[PDB]
């Protein structure tokens, strides 16, 4: 009865273990901080509980007396995947496994 749909059962196994890898292995989100700066790894532990994040840029002094500021930047980045296309694919697999087996 299922002899003719074993290949779709395989494909649905492979798809779902792919999504389970994506979940395991990538970090949900991280606080990205760029630019020339000093971060004390003891102070970083306050990251959960601080209210203000202050970035003071490195000031570069030129031999002719000029002064100019480095580009600091900071903000959250978060992982994302194509939910629309992968779920439409897995819904097609489930639907077809059921269709060909009545």
């Amino acid at each position: 009865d299922y002899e003719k749909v074993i290949t779709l059962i395989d494909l649905y196994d492979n798809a779902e273990s792919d999504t389970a890898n994506y979940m395991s292995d990538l970090n949900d989100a991280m606080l990205l901080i760029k630019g020339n700066l000093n971060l004390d790894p003891v102070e970083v532990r306050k990251q959960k509980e601080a209210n203000v994040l202050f970035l003071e840029p490195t000031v570069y002094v030129d031999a002719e007396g000029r002064e100019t500021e480095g580009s600091v930047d900071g903000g959250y980045i978060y992982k994302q995947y194509d939910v629309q296309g992968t779920e439409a694919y897995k819904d097609r697999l489930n639907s077809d496994i059921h269709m060909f087996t009545n």
């Binding site: 000093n38 102070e43 994040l53 002064e67």
Partner: peptide, 12 residues
């Protein structure tokens, strides 16, 4: 004569 002063990131 001033010299290059490195920046700081602080969380308060």
């Amino acid at each position: 004569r001033t010299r290059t002063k490195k920046g700081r990131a602080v969380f308060f």
